[PDB]
Design a protein around this nucleic acid. Structure first.
Ligand code: MG
Ligand code: MG
Length: 132
RNA sequence: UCGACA
DNA sequence: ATGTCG
């Protein structure tokens, strides 16, 4: 019941909070379609959120109707809400990630999409294909 | 008091 | 260990 014709996204970090990056891959082939340059400080859930929104933008720009898989129940909710409810402190070190989050929320508030955002079922299917 | 997703 | 929701 895996929808193979899909984009899978995941976060990787060093620390949490710590250095965050994320990437999007073709679920079928594992081909890397996008990978964000590491952000010096962020949280796991911020990165999982940014990964989904990046995926939406990526598919929208390419007129693709593929769903997105994420394993993050938090990020899936934040996207649905158009609101990333992070409690990461705001300072000069976290300014960059908070700016990307704000801009992601803004994108969600200014664009439509029909992309299904699906939960990757890790316990049944193993690690998401975008895992680091 | 947890349970769960990461 | 921490970030998050049910
Ligand atoms: Mg994940
Ligand atoms: Mg992972």
């Amino acid at each position: 019941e895996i929808i193979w014709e899909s984009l899978s996204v995941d976060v990787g970090s060093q620390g949490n909070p710590g250095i965050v990056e994320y990437k999007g891959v073709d679920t079928k082939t594992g081909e890397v379609l996008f990978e964000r340059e590491p952000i010096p400080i962020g949280t796991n859930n911020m990165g999982e959120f940014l990964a989904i929104v990046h995926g939406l933008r990526y598919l929208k720009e390419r007129n693709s109707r593929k769903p997105i898989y994420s394993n993050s129940q938090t990020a899936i909710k934040w996207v649905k809400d158009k609101k990333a409810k992070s409690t990461l402190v705001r300072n000069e070190e976290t300014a960059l990630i908070w700016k990307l989050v704000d801009e992601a929320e803004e994108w969600l508030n200014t664009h439509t999409y029909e992309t299904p955002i699906l939960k990757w079922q890790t316990d049944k299917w193993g690690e998401i294909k975008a895992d680091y």
